[PDB]
Amino acid sequence: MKFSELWLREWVNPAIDSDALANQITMAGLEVDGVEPVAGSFHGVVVGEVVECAQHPNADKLRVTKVNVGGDRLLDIVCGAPNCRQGLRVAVATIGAVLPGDFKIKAAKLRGEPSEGMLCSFSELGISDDHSGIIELPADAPIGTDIREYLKLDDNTIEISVTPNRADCLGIIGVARDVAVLNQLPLVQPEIVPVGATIDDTLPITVEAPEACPRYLGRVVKGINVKAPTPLWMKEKLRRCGIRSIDAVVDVTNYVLLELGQPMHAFDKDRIEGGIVVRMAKEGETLVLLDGTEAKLNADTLVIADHNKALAMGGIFGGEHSGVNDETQNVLLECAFFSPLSITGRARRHGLHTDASHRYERGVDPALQHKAMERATRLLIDICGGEAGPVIDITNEATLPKRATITLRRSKLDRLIGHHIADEQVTDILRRLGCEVTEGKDEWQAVAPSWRFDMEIEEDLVEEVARVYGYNNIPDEPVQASLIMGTHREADLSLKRVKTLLNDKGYQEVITYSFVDPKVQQMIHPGVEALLLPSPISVEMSAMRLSLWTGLLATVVYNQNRQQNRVRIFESGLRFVPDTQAPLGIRQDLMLAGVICGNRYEEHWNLAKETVDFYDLKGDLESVLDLTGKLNEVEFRAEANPALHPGQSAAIYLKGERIGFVGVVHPELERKLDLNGRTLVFELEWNKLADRVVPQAREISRFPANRRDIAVVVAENVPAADILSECKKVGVNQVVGVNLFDVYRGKGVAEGYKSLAISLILQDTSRTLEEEEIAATVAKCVEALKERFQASLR
């Protein structure tokens, strides 16, 4: 909503300046988005009259004029505008004037003829983009007056955001009424005299949807001149409210919409066949809108039709050929109240958003249509001529909305606000807002005014009292509540603790978009259909991520394009995998993913330049998993994933539960995406590992321990962790430590085989061990590795 400050001040003029008024409007709940002057800054421009106008003797398209500005003599001014003529009232930038841009006006010659000033256009004065010609003023414009006084250019266009509540603040009367309340001033309203019909011309009007249209006012105005010019005062009030001047008929209805908040429409009466029928559209009924596009309507959309065809979308948009055209001589003015529930959503369904639809779906004052109809009728005739018939009133009192009677209790008022507001101030506020207030026993009975569509319950009055009393007049006070601890679980593993470990392992956190490019995600997860976004922000951000690798790898490429090869990042966030057994057909799992690439370290004088490999990333994952205390129950199994190297990829398991994946990005996928080199990614299902073992103290042996190293040769395809795990399982009471310290595969072992050097720590809590018991337990582990893996001791 944009409006002129001076126009608003014709209804209420508080003794405060422009800045205090805009702040007052914001402090009422109407956030001011901006305050702009209605014209450029300048001086020395006055009204003038072209007393004489002749052809420039040395320039074809120029003219030499004698301009009267009320001085001691007439002025010589050269002008090239095609509308300059011998009777025009114009804006004259005299000598010494400074136009916008510090454009000083001096006496000079243009193509040889003297010019003592300049005739101004709206564009040259910063008023509008109209540079077609010079400004044409009314014939009674005072010659000696500054045009800043005559055109009232010392004005501001105030732009406010109006939330869906406060449907009453979408016109001048509505904003001025609320400003009047805040200033405790009475509202000054213009005298709108009913016109009084001079003809009896009507047409039949039937409302078939009285619930959608409880009131339809039609009026025949016969013999108008649609080509009549809009007066400048109306053109300016339109412009300063953000509306361009089109033609006289729609300028009038737009002026009434801005002045009173009431949308109006004019049909061509000679194109209405039979009469007007206000009815629901038929399912599939088509209508060519005013923009030349076709609308295929549903049976829930209100239309203004005639006896044969639909003419317009009720309270939304007009039709192409039913509206006012160049040869229209008789119109039917429409002024209606449409129920908001019958209008809401229909405009957005067809990509429409008009001044009419915006107001009707929020709520137009249902006591306003007669005053607006008489306002538009008088303005239309005073501008275009013609004669008015009687107002055709089709009002259904049963479906008209009822003003709500709301009880406001002192107790609820004091509890919700926490600050006592005097009884007299509560009654005064509600009455100044338009409520009929009956004071009672510690409660008020208020009947909401007809224009408020946000006054239904007791809390609505609490907000009205509080906002007019002033939010910042309500003091601060801390919450007084109980101090209860809540439920803690030491077995919880904090995600913030895991992020802290990754930071302490050289990882930077990143946050990527949850929707990604499906063309890139199909390269990482081919054949996996992701939940796509109908009508997205872009096709490159239209696929809900099946994992975090698409965003992570995009971040890698993003930084590598800026001369940063070494990238070590992680991200926590949800993945979106379609699943018919999941709620809403989509499973949303919190994931923890990351990627490393480049050298192991930055260039260091003592650390070698080597690229990161699988065991660099796995080591960081073991550090994460070790926070759960269940690292001994973690298994890394070689498993295929289309995005990873098949020989350097692993599925991560925790007590037999798959919790994630890790591996080197496949070289083909690495060459795609244009990765600078070997890159390694992982992703973990967070809630699978968000638990940790609560420690239980175990007895520590006061007796020395023994170390026995064994050389185990197995097939190459035997996972080394299974050998170690089997050693820890068979030795339970004595074997307190199993560690692999060497892996060999070369000269000394057969091809396809490998030797695993394993250390076994043996210790007892009650005695020292001798060679007989040590070798017996060590041999028990060797035969276990021989039974399960067919291993051999070297």
């Binding site: 101090l483 209860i484 601890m485 809540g486 439920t487 803690h488 679980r489 030491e490 470990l501 699988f614 065991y615 660099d616 990333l617 796995k618 080591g619 960081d620 994952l621 073991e622 550090s623 070790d626 926070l627 205390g629 298994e635 890394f636 199994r637 070689a638 190297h645 098949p646 020989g647 350097q648 990829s649 692993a650 591996g663 070289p667 609560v694 420690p695 239980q696 103290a697 175990r698 520590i700 996972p719 080394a720 962790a721 299974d722 692999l740 892996v743």
Partner: protein, 241 residues
Amino acid sequence: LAAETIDVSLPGRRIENGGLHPVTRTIDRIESFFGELGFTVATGPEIEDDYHNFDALNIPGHHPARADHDTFWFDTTRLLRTQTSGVQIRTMKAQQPPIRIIAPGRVYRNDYDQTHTPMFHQMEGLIVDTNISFTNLKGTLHDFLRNFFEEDLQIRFRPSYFPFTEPSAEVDVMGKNGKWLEVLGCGMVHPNVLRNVGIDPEVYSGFAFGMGMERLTMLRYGVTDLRSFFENDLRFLKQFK
């Protein structure tokens, strides 16, 4: 192309994670329990004078709980603190209620036993406000013990004596052996204590509590000997990662 197949089960390249001392784990748990109640953590010097450790806590020079206290004295004024109340006295002298502080730290008693060390860790809490009651003392410590041991365990309050509180109490939890186990001492702040720090006992009231960190750590994680805490055997400390 090339088949650079590796054993993904081999141990990754990393340095082993260290852990926190079990007493530190206990202190951090309790601090987070009371932090959600608006309690601030406050610390202070382990060597105090006889005023903050005794006189400010309503313990005159002729009080039995002074010489018969196993206190490490350096001279007639300086000592190794037996309470963490010194920071509670200084904070109360610098500000008016509301007060909500917990004070962990090391305290010192003389005797050395299988269940007693010359140095141990103690946490003391203090809240001062307008209508703080004994019911609030019971409800706050009951919630704490339920969260610390993570079970609807059976507790009891029992009369006791502390010169800085009146009424005073001790709290026991039903031990696994069928006997009551003293877990903490508490009570309503004595009016002399509030009066000496400029707080009006007719307007404000509060409760205080105190507990040994080693003792609660033993009950929580099943540590049988208190000496293990200060021997710092890496095999013992590694269990609490």
